[PDB]
Amino acid sequence: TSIAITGSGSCRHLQFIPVAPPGIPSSVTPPTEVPDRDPEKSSEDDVY
Amino acid sequence: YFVLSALGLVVCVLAVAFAAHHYSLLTHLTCENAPDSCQCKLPSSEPLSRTFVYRDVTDCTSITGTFQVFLLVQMVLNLVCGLVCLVACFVMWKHRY
Numbered sequence: 133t134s135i136a137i138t139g140s141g142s143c144r145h146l147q148f149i150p151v152a153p154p155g156i157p158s159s160v161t162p163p164t165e166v167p168d169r170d171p172e173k174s175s176e177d178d179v180y
Numbered sequence: 181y182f183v184l185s186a187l188g189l190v191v192c193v194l195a196v197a198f199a200a201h202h203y204s205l206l207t208h209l210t211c212e213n214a215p216d217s218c219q220c221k222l223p224s225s226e227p228l229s230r231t232f233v234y235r236d237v238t239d240c241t242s243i244t245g246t247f248q249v250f251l252l253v254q255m256v257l258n259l260v261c262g263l264v265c266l267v268a269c270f271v272m273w274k275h276r277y
Contacts, residue, residue, distance in 0.1 A: 172228035 182276075185268045192262035199255040206248060211240040218243055 139146035147153070211220035214233070218240040221231035234243060 170228075171230065172224070172226060173230045 182269060182272050185265045185272065189262050189265035189269065192258045192265060195258040196255055196262060199251050199258060203248060203251045203255070206243070206251070211243060213238075213240055 135149065137149045139148055209220040209222055209232075211218050211234075216236060216238065218234040218237045219231050220234065220240070220243070221229045223229065234240075237243065
């Protein structure tokens with residue numbers, strides 16, 4: 133009745149049975165890079 | 181009147197001291213241009229250092245230019261006003277004692 137030839141293993145990104153798939157995946161949102169910097173400080177008590 | 185002349189003298193002296201200290205500070209900072217701001221940090225023996233952010237400043241020259249000129253004018257005016265208050269007190273007690 134039906135034949136479904138599908139990829140796997142090293143063919144993960146490949147499907148070979150034409151089902152007419154219109155699937156268009158979205159794009160990964162760019163996350164803001166958050167580098168952490170801890171330089172030394174002179175005392176803010178110098179102000180007082 | 182004598183009390184307020186003394187108060188003006190002490191306030192002008194405090195202003196002189198604060199202006200001189202701020203100028204002495206600003207003589208020893210190295211500053212760089214940050215987006216619509218300035219980041220002025222101080223050299224240190226250790227690689228770490230303490231910095232300061234001056235916002236709403238396009239170029240740090242305004243901090244190294246008209247700002248120190250403003251400080252010099254402010255301290256000159258403050259010392260002149262303190263001298264005026266002191267000599268006002270001087271004449272007051274030269275006519276009062």
